[PDB]
């Protein structure tokens, strides 16, 4: 009964006669991917109305879910792919696409192929399981190498293992300073101690019961600790990816920007509840904590953009607008987190239409 091409939508009788035709007026690759996947577009919604208004009823379509949307629109519809409408349409391209028909199929086919650059995949559960046991293994190599680092540094400062139970802090000290005798309060404040802890280490500054690690022995201990930072970065690459391999049931916060950004936004908030409570004028700078620190201590230059930086609208837009984009982009993300926590409906393509409306202005104003 009905079939479609790159230029429009066509209805035919059971002897192959045309009934009516309509043409596309938006960028057609979008309109095609809907109709190819059984979703209804406005020119088809008007065409089937025009057929009921002209008194036609034997509605057979090519795709099963198009017959499903048609009977949801009320119309008594069936499915068969080799039907006379698809046969007329695909046999006589010059009636429906003109003289240069293969160039028009080419022009839109490559555009449709460029929007079909997929996410969601049928094997990502196997990748979650390997990322989970890889986090379990990498957290275990870090515990082994930090235990070796503790037993080795106990030849220079044996009280230090009995004083610092936290594992990243014990590596950050050796990356930054490593020499026991170059310690003072200021380099213990940034290291993330508490005041009741900072008098220890210093109480033992000369009088620790450990020996002497050479300026050439602390070198191999430092090269060992420097590799544990690259392994903490691998642990963080996996701790970002564990959500990135689950999110193929896509939230609005994912679909507005990209998966590693949604995972890090929740990772820096501590939860989706917290992110759905934060304002745009905090989500703008979320994660910029080593910039917040230096600004709070001085009243100097403020933090410009947080975790949202690694997205194309900021990391490829002029620095003059890398602040101006960040406030409103954090606003549409602040709404996306509230939709995902309270509402549960999917609106990401409208949040994208709305975010591109403010970005379009920022490309005409400047």
């Amino acid at each position: 009964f009905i079939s479609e091409n790159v230029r429009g939508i066509y209805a035919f009788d059971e002897n192959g006669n045309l009934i009516e035709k309509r043409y596309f007026t938006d960028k057609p690759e979008k309109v095609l991917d809907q109709l190819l996947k059984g979703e209804i577009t406005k020119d088809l919604e008007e065409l089937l109305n025009s057929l009921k208004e002209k008194g036609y009823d034997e509605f057979v379509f090519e795709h099963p879910e198009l017959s499903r949307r048609a009977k949801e629109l009320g119309f008594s519809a069936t499915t068969e792919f080799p039907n006379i409408a698809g046969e007329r349409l695909r046999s006589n391209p010059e009636e429906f696409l003109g003289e240069n028909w293969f160039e028009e199929y080419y022009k839109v086919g490559v555009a449709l192929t460029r929007m079909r650059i997929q996410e969601q995949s049928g094997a990502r559960d196997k990748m979650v399981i390997q990322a989970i046991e890889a986090l379990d293994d990498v957290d275990k190599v870090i515990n082994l190498l930090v235990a070796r680092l503790r037993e080795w540094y106990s030849l220079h400062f044996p009280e230090l293992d009995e004083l610092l139970p936290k594992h990243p802090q014990y590596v950050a000290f050796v990356k930054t300073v490593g020499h026991r005798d170059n310690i003072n309060e200021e380099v213990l404040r940034e290291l993330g101690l508490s005041e009741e802890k900072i008098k220890k280490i210093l109480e033992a500054k000369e009088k620790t019961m450990g020996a002497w690690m050479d300026q050439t022995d602390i070198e191999v201990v430092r090269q060992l600790a420097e590799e544990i930072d690259r392994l903490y970065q691998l642990r963080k690459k996996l701790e970002d990816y564990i959500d990135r391999a689950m999110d193929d049931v896509a939230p609005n916060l994912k679909a507005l920007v990209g998966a590693k950004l949604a995972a890090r936004l929740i990772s820096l908030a501590g939860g989706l509840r917290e992110l759905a409570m934060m304002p745009s004028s905090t989500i703008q700078v979320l994660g910029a904590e080593k910039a917040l620190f230096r600004h709070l201590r001085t009243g100097a230059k403020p933090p410009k953009h947080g975790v949202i930086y690694q997205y194309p609208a900021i990391n490829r837009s002029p620095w003059w607008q890398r602040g101006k984009i960040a406030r409103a982009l954090a606003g549409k993300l602040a709404i996306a987190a509230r939709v995902d926590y309270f509402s549960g409906e999917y609106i990401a393509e409208e949040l994208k239409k709305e975010l591109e409306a403010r970005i379009r202005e920022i490309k005409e104003k400047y």
Binding site: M278, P279, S281, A334, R338, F342
Partner: protein, 121 residues
């Protein structure tokens, strides 16, 4: 139909909450718009918070009720965001507003807080 209006109100108090902004405007300390409202609730600075009934999408203001309840702050609703913005001294709209020092309105904010507390039952 907004979902954040977690109690129905009589034909009273709401115009009195708008009046509590109009007399605080030039006499007190106010924060206007939902992101500065969220800062004023988060920093425990608000003494009253006000939300409009005509906000669309609702998922910009939808977080305010549980966020201000978990901080023991009085809350109320008013009919429209353009009128709420105009009372809060600005020429645009505001989806919500917070009063931080009510100035002249201190005794009226205490009337609103104590009478809202008797209908949250």
């Amino acid at each position: 139909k907004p979902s954040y209006v977690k109690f129905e109100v009589p034909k009273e108090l709401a115009e009195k909450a708008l009046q509590a902004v109009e007399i605080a405007r030039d006499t007190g300390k106010i924060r206007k718009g939902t992101n500065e409202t969220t800062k004023a609730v988060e920093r425990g600075q608000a003494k009253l918070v006000i939300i409009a009934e005509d906000v669309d999408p609702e998922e910009i203001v939808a977080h305010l009720p549980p966020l201000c309840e978990e901080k023991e702050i009085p809350y109320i609703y008013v009919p429209s965001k353009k009128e709420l913005g105009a009372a809060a001294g600005i020429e645009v709209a505001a989806a919500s507003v917070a009063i931080i020092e009510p100035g002249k309105a201190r005794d009226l904010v205490e009337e609103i807080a104590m009478k809202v507390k008797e209908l949250m039952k």
